[PDB]
Design a protein around this ligand. Structure first.
Ligand code: TK7
Lengths: 99, 99
């Protein structure tokens, strides 16, 4: 689809078999989701945003469906203000900016 | 043009007679630029992201040229680590997400 930006570009995602809403965020290098339970091993990591740095749980090679497009990659879980899909998965679903 | 997301979507902008590099950021509601001494009146504001909030100065009706496309609207100025073009101006240059 083509998505205009008059409103936040929120889409439904499916991860761990559960549905959620997430923001397509071209300014995010990485995908960061709010606190949730995900199976498999995870490594503690840090990521920085406009307000400073936070501690997150890094899950590698995670299956995640974004607006009907499948991705498999790194998902960070932690106290982000909102669920964001970053460039590491936006590239996988073929997302581009166009103007 | 079409911008892929393999790397950060950085482009040249022109504001207050200065050229700068800025991130085209669909995750940012509003444009926030690194510290610069703009003229005119302003209002204090707090914007939040990963890590918490920062204090910024809100200027209204500021002209920004983004890749030769002219836009005018709210521009926040403060201690952001990166120049960020948010949705308030991305809409004005016809920018969309596509996959
Ligand atoms: C310590 C920093 O290190 P740096 O290298 C790069 O810092 C940054 C790089 C990009 C961004 C931009 C930010 N990206 C981000 O948080 O992404 C993080 C996860 O992915 C990696 O990749 C980049 C960082 C992490 C979002 O796109 C936009 N935000 C909102 C979003 C939705 C609520 C927040 C999830 S907002 O808060 O900024 C914002 C809020 C209101 C506004 N009116 C305007 C902006 C901020 C800082 O610079 C120092 C050398």
């Amino acid at each position: 689809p083509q998505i205009t930006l008059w409103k936040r570009p929120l889409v439904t995602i499916k991860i761990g078999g559960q549905l959620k809403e997430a923001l397509l965020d071209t300014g995010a290098d990485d995908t960061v989701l709010e606190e949730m339970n995900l199976p498999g091993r995870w490594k503690p990591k840090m990521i920085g945003g406009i307000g400073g740095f936070i501690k997150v749980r890094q899950y590698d090679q995670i299956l995640i469906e974004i607006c009907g497009h499948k991705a498999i990659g790194t998902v960070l879980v932690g106290p982000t203000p909102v669920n964001i899909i970053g460039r590491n998965l936006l590239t996988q679903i073929g997302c581009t900016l166009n103007f």
